[PDB]
Design an enzyme around this catalytic site. Structure first.
Site, PDB file in Angstrom:
ATOM      1  CG  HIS A 109      -1.919   1.195   1.080  1.00  0.00           C
ATOM      2  ND1 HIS A 109      -3.041   1.162   0.282  1.00  0.00           N
ATOM      3  CD2 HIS A 109      -1.872   2.439   1.612  1.00  0.00           C
ATOM      4  CE1 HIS A 109      -3.665   2.323   0.355  1.00  0.00           C
ATOM      5  NE2 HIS A 109      -2.973   3.116   1.150  1.00  0.00           N
ATOM      6  CG  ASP A 152      -0.399   5.623   0.191  1.00  0.00           C
ATOM      7  OD1 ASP A 152      -1.524   5.566  -0.346  1.00  0.00           O
ATOM      8  OD2 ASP A 152      -0.223   5.483   1.422  1.00  0.00           O
ATOM      9  CG  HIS A 170       0.643  10.985   1.938  1.00  0.00           C
ATOM     10  ND1 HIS A 170       0.516  10.257   0.776  1.00  0.00           N
ATOM     11  CD2 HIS A 170      -0.185  10.408   2.838  1.00  0.00           C
ATOM     12  CE1 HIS A 170      -0.358   9.284   0.964  1.00  0.00           C
ATOM     13  NE2 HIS A 170      -0.797   9.352   2.208  1.00  0.00           N
TER      14      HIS A 170
HETATM   15  C1  LIG Z   1      -1.566   4.022   5.325  1.00  0.00           C
HETATM   16  C2  LIG Z   1      -1.077   5.495   5.392  1.00  0.00           C
HETATM   17  O1  LIG Z   1      -0.066   5.784   4.397  1.00  0.00           O
HETATM   18  C3  LIG Z   1      -2.301   6.372   5.115  1.00  0.00           C
HETATM   19  N1  LIG Z   1      -3.456   6.092   5.904  1.00  0.00           N
HETATM   20  C4  LIG Z   1      -3.743   6.804   7.103  1.00  0.00           C
HETATM   21  O2  LIG Z   1      -2.943   7.525   7.555  1.00  0.00           O
HETATM   22  C5  LIG Z   1      -4.950   6.387   7.903  1.00  0.00           C
HETATM   23  C6  LIG Z   1      -5.199   6.907   9.172  1.00  0.00           C
HETATM   24  C7  LIG Z   1      -6.268   6.429   9.936  1.00  0.00           C
HETATM   25  C8  LIG Z   1      -7.107   5.437   9.432  1.00  0.00           C
HETATM   26  C9  LIG Z   1      -8.110   4.774  10.274  1.00  0.00           C
HETATM   27  C10 LIG Z   1      -8.916   4.235  10.955  1.00  0.00           C
HETATM   28  C11 LIG Z   1      -9.791   3.561  11.735  1.00  0.00           C
HETATM   29  C12 LIG Z   1     -10.536   2.936  12.424  1.00  0.00           C
HETATM   30  C13 LIG Z   1     -11.423   2.192  13.245  1.00  0.00           C
HETATM   31  C14 LIG Z   1     -11.726   0.872  12.931  1.00  0.00           C
HETATM   32  C15 LIG Z   1     -12.598   0.149  13.737  1.00  0.00           C
HETATM   33  C16 LIG Z   1     -13.167   0.746  14.856  1.00  0.00           C
HETATM   34  C17 LIG Z   1     -12.865   2.066  15.171  1.00  0.00           C
HETATM   35  C18 LIG Z   1     -11.993   2.788  14.365  1.00  0.00           C
HETATM   36  C19 LIG Z   1      -6.864   4.933   8.158  1.00  0.00           C
HETATM   37  C20 LIG Z   1      -5.800   5.408   7.397  1.00  0.00           C
HETATM   38  C21 LIG Z   1      -2.675   6.296   3.658  1.00  0.00           C
HETATM   39  O3  LIG Z   1      -3.201   5.328   3.108  1.00  0.00           O
HETATM   40  N2  LIG Z   1      -2.513   7.426   2.887  1.00  0.00           N
HETATM   41  O4  LIG Z   1      -2.894   7.223   1.621  1.00  0.00           O
HETATM   42 ZN   LIG Z   2      -3.060   5.219   1.054  1.00  0.00          ZN
END
Ligand SMILES: C[C@@H](O)[C@H](NC(=O)c1ccc(C#CC#Cc2ccccc2)cc1)C(=O)NO
Ligand SMILES: [Zn+2]
Length: 272
Positions: free
Chosen positions: A225, A229, A252
């Site tokens: 992933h 990104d 990012h």
């Molecule tokens: C991957 C990184 O690069 C980035 N993702 C994030 O930073 C990120 C932050 C928080 C969450 C979340 C959540 C949640 C939850 C939850 C689930 C069940 C019960 C309660 C809350 C998802 C992605 C990303 O993919 N950027 O493209």
């Molecule tokens: Zn992502």
């Protein structure tokens, strides 16, 4: 290859991972030379680094008082399919997260490509470069093909992982989902993000366990992933990219820093 657009309008919809709001997309065909751009409330926002307004936990773009959160996954898919001319109309504040991966976008767009009449002017990395920030690093060097390696060092059972994408292996990264660690989610919510995150769209990991009943799609899903990104953020150069990239713990912010340094180097071959 040839510049490409979509044959027909394509629509997607659903909740956004950070806003938690429901939004809709319409992807519109565009002629040669248009580039990739978003459209919201009468305003065009080019998918270029100059329009980046936020890079913490997502890459967000804005222009003239209109903002769109989380452009990285749709941009990565367009980059991988070398769609070069398209308008992504957004009704809402964020791109839908769907299942957390690029899969739904990728499958729908791949079956709806229209070849156009000139060749792509790729952004070709011309010489080696390295950018660093607080232990994180990204390197780029010339390559005839897009090659992207991400190495992570996770503070849980995953430990150290690395994954390399090369052209032809697009299907190896378009199903890898966004992920989060349980000990970080409270902070993310406290700073106004992650409102739409759930086990339906996020791989949630603890120190010693996986929360998702379905488990991981790949043992190294997280670094797949991260590669996905980075490929999305690289498209902010404004053209599909040829170069070999290696990211150690990048995110990012560092991705966009690299993009801005590369763009500055070539602004007088590109703008012409
Ligand atoms: C991957 C990184 O690069 C980035 N993702 C994030 O930073 C990120 C932050 C928080 C969450 C979340 C959540 C949640 C939850 C939850 C689930 C069940 C019960 C309660 C809350 C998802 C992605 C990303 O993919 N950027 O493209
Ligand atoms: Zn992502």
């Amino acid at each position: 290859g040839l510049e490409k657009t979509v044959k027909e309008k394509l629509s997607f919809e659903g909740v956004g991972i950070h806003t938690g709001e429901y939004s809709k997309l319409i992807i519109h065909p565009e002629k040669e030379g248009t580039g990739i751009r978003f459209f919201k409330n009468g305003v065009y926002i080019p998918a270029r680094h100059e329009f980046v307004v936020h890079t913490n936990h997502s890459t967000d773009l804005g222009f003239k008082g209109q903002r769109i959160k989380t452009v990285e996954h749709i941009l990565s898919v367009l980059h991988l399919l070398e769609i070069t001319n398209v308008t992504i109309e957004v009704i809402g504040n964020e791109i839908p997260i769907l299942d957390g991966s690029g899969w739904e976008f990728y499958e729908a767009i791949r079956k709806n490509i229209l070849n156009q009449n000139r060749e792509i002017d790729y952004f070709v990395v011309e010489e080696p470069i390295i950018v660093e920030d607080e232990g994180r690093l990204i390197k780029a060097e010339p390559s005839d093909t897009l090659e992207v390696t991400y190495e992570g060092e996770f503070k849980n059972f995953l430990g150290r992982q690395k994954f390399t994408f090369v052209e032809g292996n697009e299907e190896e990264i378009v199903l890898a989902r966004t992920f989060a660690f349980d000990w970080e989610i409270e902070h993310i919510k406290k700073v106004g993000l992650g409102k739409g995150g759930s086990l339906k769209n996020t791989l949630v990991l603890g120190k010693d366990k996986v929360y998702n009943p379905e488990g991981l799609r790949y043992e190294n899903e997280p670094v797949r992933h991260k590669v996905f990104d980075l490929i999305g953020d690289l498209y902010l150069l404004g053209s599909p990219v040829k170069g070999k990239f290696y990211s150690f713990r990048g995110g990012h912010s560092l991705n966009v820093k690299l993009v801005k340094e590369l763009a500055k180097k070539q602004k007088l071959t590109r703008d012409l």
